[PDB]
Amino acid sequence: GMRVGVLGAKGKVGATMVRAVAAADDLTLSAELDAGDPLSLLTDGNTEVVIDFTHPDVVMGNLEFLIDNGIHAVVGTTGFTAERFQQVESWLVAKPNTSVLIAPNFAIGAVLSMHFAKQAARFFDSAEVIELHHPHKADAPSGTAARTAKLIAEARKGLPPNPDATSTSLPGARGADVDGIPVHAVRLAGLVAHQEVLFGTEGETLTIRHDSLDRTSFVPGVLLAVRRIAERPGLTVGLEPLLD
Amino acid sequence: GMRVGVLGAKGKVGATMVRAVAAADDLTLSAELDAGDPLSLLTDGNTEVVIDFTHPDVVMGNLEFLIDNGIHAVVGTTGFTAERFQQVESWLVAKPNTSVLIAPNFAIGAVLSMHFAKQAARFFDSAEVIELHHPHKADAPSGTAARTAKLIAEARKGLPPNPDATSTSLPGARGADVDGIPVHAVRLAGLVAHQEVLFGTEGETLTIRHDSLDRTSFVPGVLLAVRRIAERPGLTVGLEPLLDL
Amino acid sequence: GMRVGVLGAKGKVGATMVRAVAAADDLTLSAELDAGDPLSLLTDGNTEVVIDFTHPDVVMGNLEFLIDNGIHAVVGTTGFTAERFQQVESWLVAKPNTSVLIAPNFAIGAVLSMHFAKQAARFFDSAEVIELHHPHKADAPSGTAARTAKLIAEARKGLPPNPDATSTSLPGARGADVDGIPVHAVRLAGLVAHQEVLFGTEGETLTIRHDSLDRTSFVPGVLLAVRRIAERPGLTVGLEPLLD
Amino acid sequence: GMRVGVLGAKGKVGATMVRAVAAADDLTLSAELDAGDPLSLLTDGNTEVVIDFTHPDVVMGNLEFLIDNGIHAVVGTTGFTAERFQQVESWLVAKPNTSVLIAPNFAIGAVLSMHFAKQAARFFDSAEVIELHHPHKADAPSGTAARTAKLIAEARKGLPPNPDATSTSLPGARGADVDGIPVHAVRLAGLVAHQEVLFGTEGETLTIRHDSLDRTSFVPGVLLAVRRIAERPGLTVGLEPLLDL
Ligand SMILES: NC(=O)c1ccc[n+]([C@@H]2O[C@H](COP(=O)([O-])OP(=O)(O)OC[C@H]3O[C@@H](n4cnc5c(N)ncnc54)[C@H](O)[C@@H]3O)[C@@H](O)[C@H]2O)c1
Ligand SMILES: NC(=O)c1ccc[n+]([C@@H]2O[C@H](COP(=O)([O-])OP(=O)(O)OC[C@H]3O[C@@H](n4cnc5c(N)ncnc54)[C@H](O)[C@@H]3O)[C@@H](O)[C@H]2O)c1
């Protein structure tokens, strides 16, 4: 059984992961840190892997310590840039046996969904994204939808644009344009989080739908990442490569 | 056994209805007119009901003749304004046994779907419409989606608006506003014509989806209208009242 | 504001309805009874309407008292037969101003869904039902699905059967037969309760889908019934007539 | 620029592929054979690739000739057993530059859908397949659904079975069992061919849906196979490996 530490243990996600690690028989909780706890608590407790959902301003310092001490890191904290990835990559040159996974989404369905979308995108004339959320959601479209449409568009570099004969419309009917890909945002009481990618070509359509029916649906992807992170030395960006 | 005439018999929809009337055992084709044929061909053939898919510039003159001679009319021709409806209603006062049905949708699935949407609308916090069509379609949103959202909005008079906390958006993300109801138009190769109405309230959602997989799916609604139109004297707007719901 | 009592106040549903009535500004909780409390508590507190989710063995006695004292009843308790409806009908002859609503389902979406299904059934060649539930569900198909298929079949009396050319099949592929209507039951981790009715005819299909994303989704139908029950004197069976 | 022959040129699928090859600018029709035409017509016309949709009783003899003369083969003909596959593999050892693709589905949407299903299968507690077809369909479940469920089951070797507390059921409610995966077959007028794979785990679900709205939707997959088959020497089973995923 692996020894797992949690950074950000009192936060919304951290406290959830503490409970998840305690429930899982194969993972033993080795340390549980929040703000102001020294990172040496992780080595004092023989931690092998850490789950980090902290804050963009502290995650770089934490990562330096972790990599330095041979502690694998599963990181959900956001605010990662190209420069930050570089820096992490450089720290790992010194520590070739250490694995760091930095991912913006740990829901397995969402991760598979994005990957399927990217793989299918080149074979169809048309692609559109539809996302549906509860009406308390502030941003339209969602981050996941906009990220998905950007991947689709990138996979479609050098294909013709979506065919569209629209010559009379009310404004807004055709959705938002995200790198040439229409994205539609439905806001409906009674929903949680849902996303459909639609692909079409004469004669056939393909749809990939992800439905998240509770806020904690990301937990198994984080546990999966903890159980597998050591299979890939160095930096992995996104959960997809651990899934393979 | 009914005697049925078709006006617009060489058009896309007219020629299709000619074939449909000929196939149906209980309906006899009595006349088949296109542009330049005199309307007296209808009475020379003892027409009881006419199916009219012509053009907004000729339908009012055809209707006057039909109503005047007691010939029931099933009309799919568009461009009908509130004033034109009022005018047809006024002609019928003189001819109280004549029936005229004017309808923008004859597909039974689409008609049912609109009627369900109107009935469900008062009972949910949220309503939205999604329509999906082949990418050769000129208008967004479609006439059917816009008409549906208008019915939903009318059924929701005096309820709060759709709840929406959206404070950051890219333009167009939330669709087009049709009388307070968002409408989203997907344009996708490989589709024909598709519409979903979504209703929601905390804890549950209800969805009504109509899929039309061929362009002639409207034919049974028109035949149904022809078979039933005489049951309702006067002007009927929309196919729903003849459905006997 | 109406004065509402709850019978079965300590039960799963009752305790939920107590909270719902207390939250609603227009409804004032007048009495809150469980097993062993005398029904005179309802009249002592000037109750106008009672919500009753008790048990089939006690609901008939409760109903007699309620009807006798001019207290409208919204009843979710099950185990109602033709004889029991008759008996209720006869008690109401004496009390023509009293309203009693007995309903097997208070989720508005489920009630509308069944009604739409019944109204559409005669216009299509084919009808099938698909229901999807979490895998902890004991019964397949669900009660709602089987009830829905029976209504569809009744609305289809005197039409031809569903066309089906199936001549080679694995057994079970075509679902369960409920009065000539195929019903399919999906059991999937991550679902709550979902039902689709599918109708088809050459050239077109119509689908009516109900999704319940939490166990308390019936609450607004019960509150709706409490707010409207007085609009119909006598016995109403099912929530549909109050919706109209 | 490739020279493409069609075997089975008068059949339903063969005649359709003849027209598709003629329309494509980069493929030249080199020969067009039906039953009773000698195979030497293929070599007399300098055929590089053949599309074969014939009949399980003739395809093995055709394949022998093709492989022997270095002609790549894209084969949609069914009735291929494990032993026949092994036999084709054995012929190709002698002809290491020849490529043969044998595939039960050429619709790109269907092929992708199966591949996604296989990739998602290990990561969810539950998997089920729903297929929907027009009511003239003879087999339930369809070959595609059964093949899909078999792939899912194989990807799930060594995981627990689908959780299911069902203790009371009407027969058939839970579908057909195909290697531990429930498959449900809907037969509905107005449909063509449709398949959904559903995966679930506490808190989330993932659905992959393929809709084919016409019977010729397989044509681009066959053309894609013809254009790429030479990239993979030897026997390829299924279209997926040529998709370059
Ligand atoms: N990738 C994903 O799937 C995903 C999903 C949700 C949230 N997030 C991200 O994860 C992060 C956490 O989200 P949250 O909602 O739980 O935030 P939160 O503010 O509720 O929790 C963060 C916790 O980290 C603690 N913390 C801060 N600095 C620390 C340090 N140096 N050492 C130990 N603990 C420290 C804080 O005291 C706090 O308790 C955010 O950056 C958010 O954007 C990612
Ligand atoms: N129609 C619907 O939508 C729907 C939905 C769920 C449950 N139900 C039905 O409603 C009933 C209640 O369900 P539950 O899960 O809350 O059951 P429960 O056993 O949790 O609650 C029943 C409560 O009623 C109380 N009770 C019994 N006799 C009483 C009396 N004479 N006076 C006052 N209280 C009394 C019990 O003490 C208990 O607390 C069941 O019959 C069930 O089948 C209906």
Side-chain angles (χ1 to χ4, degrees), chain A residues 1-11 13-85 87-244, chain B residues 1-11 13-121 123-138 140-214 216-245, chain C residues 1-11 13-85 87-244, chain D residues 1-11 13-121 123-138 140-214 216-245:
Chain A
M2 288 180 284
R3 296 191 61 77
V4 186
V6 181
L7 282 174
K10 294 181 185 285
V13 179
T16 293
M17 290 318 303
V18 167
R19 286 184 254 109
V21 172
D25 291 349
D26 71 304
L27 305 178
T28 298
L29 188 64
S30 63
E32 176 181 344
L33 288 63
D34 208 75
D37 290 322
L39 297 169
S40 56
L41 294 176
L42 302 170
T43 45
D44 290 341
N46 296 315
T47 298
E48 301 161 46
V49 190
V50 171
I51 293 165
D52 181 323
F53 280 88
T54 51
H55 186 272
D57 302 345
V58 300
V59 67
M60 291 304 281
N62 293 341
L63 273 172
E64 195 173 6
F65 176 87
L66 296 164
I67 285 163
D68 207 49
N69 288 268
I71 307 168
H72 302 315
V74 175
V75 181
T77 313
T78 49
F80 278 95
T81 60
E83 284 187 4
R84 292 184 164 195
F85 288 126
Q87 193 148 332
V88 174
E89 263 161 354
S90 74
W91 292 332
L92 292 163
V93 178
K95 303 284 172 180
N97 303 298
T98 313
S99 301
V100 178
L101 167 81
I102 296 174
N105 210 332
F106 286 93
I108 295 170
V111 173
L112 289 170
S113 169
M114 283 185 313
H115 180 70
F116 298 159
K118 161 182 165 149
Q119 282 185 132
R122 72 196 181 275
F123 302 102
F124 291 93
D125 298 327
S126 303
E128 296 203 10
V129 178
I130 300 176
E131 56 101 324
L132 329 270
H133 289 80
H134 50 86
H136 315 286
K137 186 151 204 313
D139 296 352
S142 70
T144 299
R147 218 185 290 120
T148 296
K150 287 176 212 194
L151 293 165
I152 290 174
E154 194 177 22
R156 285 162 79 86
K157 270 170 173 271
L159 274 59
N162 284 13
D164 192 4
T166 297
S167 58
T168 306
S169 57
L170 299 181
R174 296 284 296 119
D177 194 281
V178 183
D179 289 1
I181 304 300
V183 184
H184 311 267
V186 174
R187 298 295 172 260
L188 214 79
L191 295 179
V192 191
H194 318 271
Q195 187 175 279
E196 260 164 11
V197 187
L198 293 83
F199 296 106
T201 185
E202 195 49 60
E204 68 173 344
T205 71
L206 176 70
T207 299
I208 294 155
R209 184 179 168 131
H210 180 238
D211 296 277
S212 176
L213 302 169
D214 66 50
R215 294 326 187 285
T216 64
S217 66
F218 67 80
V219 171
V222 178
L223 298 180
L224 185 140
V226 165
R227 284 162 182 140
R228 294 212 200 166
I229 192 176
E231 293 171 20
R232 297 178 50 94
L235 176 59
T236 294
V237 181
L239 191 64
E240 187 276 340
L242 292 192
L243 300 178
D244 76 43
Chain B
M2 268 167 278
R3 296 190 62 78
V4 184
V6 182
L7 271 42
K10 297 181 176 160
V13 179
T16 294
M17 291 318 303
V18 166
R19 284 186 255 109
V21 171
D25 294 346
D26 70 309
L27 308 176
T28 301
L29 189 66
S30 63
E32 175 184 341
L33 289 62
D34 207 72
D37 291 320
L39 298 169
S40 53
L41 294 175
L42 302 169
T43 43
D44 291 341
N46 297 322
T47 301
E48 301 162 48
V49 192
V50 170
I51 290 166
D52 182 319
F53 281 90
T54 50
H55 184 78
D57 301 347
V58 299
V59 65
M60 290 304 280
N62 293 345
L63 273 170
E64 193 173 4
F65 176 88
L66 294 166
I67 285 164
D68 212 49
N69 288 269
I71 303 169
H72 304 317
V74 171
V75 182
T77 314
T78 48
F80 274 97
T81 58
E83 196 165 356
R84 290 184 165 191
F85 283 120
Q86 291 292 299
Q87 184 140 41
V88 172
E89 213 186 310
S90 184
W91 293 334
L92 288 165
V93 186
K95 302 286 305 179
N97 307 302
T98 312
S99 303
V100 179
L101 169 80
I102 297 174
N105 283 103
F106 283 94
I108 292 166
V111 176
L112 290 170
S113 167
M114 284 182 295
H115 180 69
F116 301 155
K118 165 186 154 60
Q119 283 184 309
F123 307 105
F124 290 94
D125 296 331
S126 304
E128 296 205 10
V129 179
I130 301 176
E131 57 102 325
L132 327 270
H133 288 80
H134 52 91
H136 312 284
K137 184 155 187 75
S142 67
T144 298
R147 218 172 286 124
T148 297
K150 287 175 211 195
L151 290 167
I152 289 170
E154 197 173 22
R156 285 163 82 80
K157 270 169 173 272
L159 273 58
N162 284 7
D164 192 4
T166 294
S167 54
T168 305
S169 64
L170 300 180
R174 297 287 295 117
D177 193 279
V178 182
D179 291 1
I181 305 300
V183 187
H184 312 267
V186 175
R187 298 293 174 260
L188 212 78
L191 294 179
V192 189
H194 318 268
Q195 189 173 281
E196 259 163 10
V197 185
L198 290 85
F199 294 105
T201 182
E202 201 178 49
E204 64 175 337
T205 73
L206 176 69
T207 299
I208 297 154
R209 188 178 167 130
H210 182 241
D211 296 277
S212 176
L213 300 104
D214 66 50
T216 64
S217 69
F218 67 80
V219 168
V222 178
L223 298 182
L224 184 140
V226 166
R227 286 161 180 137
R228 296 210 202 170
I229 191 177
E231 293 172 4
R232 295 176 51 94
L235 176 59
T236 295
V237 182
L239 188 65
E240 184 279 317
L242 296 193
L243 298 179
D244 199 20
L245 309 176
Chain C
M2 288 180 284
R3 296 191 61 77
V4 186
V6 181
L7 282 174
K10 294 181 185 285
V13 179
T16 293
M17 290 318 303
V18 167
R19 286 184 254 109
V21 172
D25 291 349
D26 71 304
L27 305 178
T28 298
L29 188 64
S30 63
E32 176 181 344
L33 288 63
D34 208 75
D37 290 322
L39 297 169
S40 56
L41 294 176
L42 302 170
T43 45
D44 290 341
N46 296 315
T47 298
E48 301 161 46
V49 190
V50 171
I51 293 165
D52 181 323
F53 280 88
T54 51
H55 186 272
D57 302 345
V58 300
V59 67
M60 291 304 281
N62 293 341
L63 273 172
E64 195 173 6
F65 176 87
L66 296 164
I67 285 163
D68 207 49
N69 288 268
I71 307 168
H72 302 315
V74 175
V75 181
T77 313
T78 49
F80 278 95
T81 60
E83 284 187 4
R84 292 184 164 195
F85 288 126
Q87 193 148 332
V88 174
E89 263 161 354
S90 74
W91 292 332
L92 292 163
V93 178
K95 303 284 172 180
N97 303 298
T98 313
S99 301
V100 178
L101 167 81
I102 296 174
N105 210 332
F106 286 93
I108 295 170
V111 173
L112 289 170
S113 169
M114 283 185 313
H115 180 70
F116 298 159
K118 161 182 165 149
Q119 282 185 132
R122 72 196 181 275
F123 302 102
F124 291 93
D125 298 327
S126 303
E128 296 203 10
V129 178
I130 300 176
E131 56 101 324
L132 329 270
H133 289 80
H134 50 86
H136 315 286
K137 186 151 204 313
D139 296 352
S142 70
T144 299
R147 218 185 290 120
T148 296
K150 287 176 212 194
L151 293 165
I152 290 174
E154 194 177 22
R156 285 162 79 86
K157 270 170 173 271
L159 274 59
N162 284 13
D164 192 4
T166 297
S167 58
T168 306
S169 57
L170 299 181
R174 296 284 296 119
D177 194 281
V178 183
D179 289 1
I181 304 300
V183 184
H184 311 267
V186 174
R187 298 295 172 260
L188 214 79
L191 295 179
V192 191
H194 318 271
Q195 187 175 279
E196 260 164 11
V197 187
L198 293 83
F199 296 106
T201 185
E202 195 49 60
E204 68 173 344
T205 71
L206 176 70
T207 299
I208 294 155
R209 184 179 168 131
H210 180 238
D211 296 277
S212 176
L213 302 169
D214 66 50
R215 294 326 187 285
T216 64
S217 66
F218 67 80
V219 171
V222 178
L223 298 180
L224 185 140
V226 165
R227 284 162 182 140
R228 294 212 200 166
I229 192 176
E231 293 171 20
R232 297 178 50 94
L235 176 59
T236 294
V237 181
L239 191 64
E240 187 276 340
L242 292 192
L243 300 178
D244 76 43
Chain D
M2 268 167 278
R3 296 190 62 78
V4 184
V6 182
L7 271 42
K10 297 181 176 160
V13 179
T16 294
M17 291 318 303
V18 166
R19 284 186 255 109
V21 171
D25 294 346
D26 70 309
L27 308 176
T28 301
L29 189 66
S30 63
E32 175 184 341
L33 289 62
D34 207 72
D37 291 320
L39 298 169
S40 53
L41 294 175
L42 302 169
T43 43
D44 291 341
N46 297 322
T47 301
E48 301 162 48
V49 192
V50 170
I51 290 166
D52 182 319
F53 281 90
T54 50
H55 184 78
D57 301 347
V58 299
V59 65
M60 290 304 280
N62 293 345
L63 273 170
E64 193 173 4
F65 176 88
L66 294 166
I67 285 164
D68 212 49
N69 288 269
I71 303 169
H72 304 317
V74 171
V75 182
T77 314
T78 48
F80 274 97
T81 58
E83 196 165 356
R84 290 184 165 191
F85 283 120
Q86 291 292 299
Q87 184 140 41
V88 172
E89 213 186 310
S90 184
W91 293 334
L92 288 165
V93 186
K95 302 286 305 179
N97 307 302
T98 312
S99 303
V100 179
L101 169 80
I102 297 174
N105 283 103
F106 283 94
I108 292 166
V111 176
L112 290 170
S113 167
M114 284 182 295
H115 180 69
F116 301 155
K118 165 186 154 60
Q119 283 184 309
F123 307 105
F124 290 94
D125 296 331
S126 304
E128 296 205 10
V129 179
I130 301 176
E131 57 102 325
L132 327 270
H133 288 80
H134 52 91
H136 312 284
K137 184 155 187 75
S142 67
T144 298
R147 218 172 286 124
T148 297
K150 287 175 211 195
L151 290 167
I152 289 170
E154 197 173 22
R156 285 163 82 80
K157 270 169 173 272
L159 273 58
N162 284 7
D164 192 4
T166 294
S167 54
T168 305
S169 64
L170 300 180
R174 297 287 295 117
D177 193 279
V178 182
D179 291 1
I181 305 300
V183 187
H184 312 267
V186 175
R187 298 293 174 260
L188 212 78
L191 294 179
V192 189
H194 318 268
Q195 189 173 281
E196 259 163 10
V197 185
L198 290 85
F199 294 105
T201 182
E202 201 178 49
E204 64 175 337
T205 73
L206 176 69
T207 299
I208 297 154
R209 188 178 167 130
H210 182 241
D211 296 277
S212 176
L213 300 104
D214 66 50
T216 64
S217 69
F218 67 80
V219 168
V222 178
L223 298 182
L224 184 140
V226 166
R227 286 161 180 137
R228 296 210 202 170
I229 191 177
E231 293 172 4
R232 295 176 51 94
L235 176 59
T236 295
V237 182
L239 188 65
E240 184 279 317
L242 296 193
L243 298 179
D244 199 20
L245 309 176

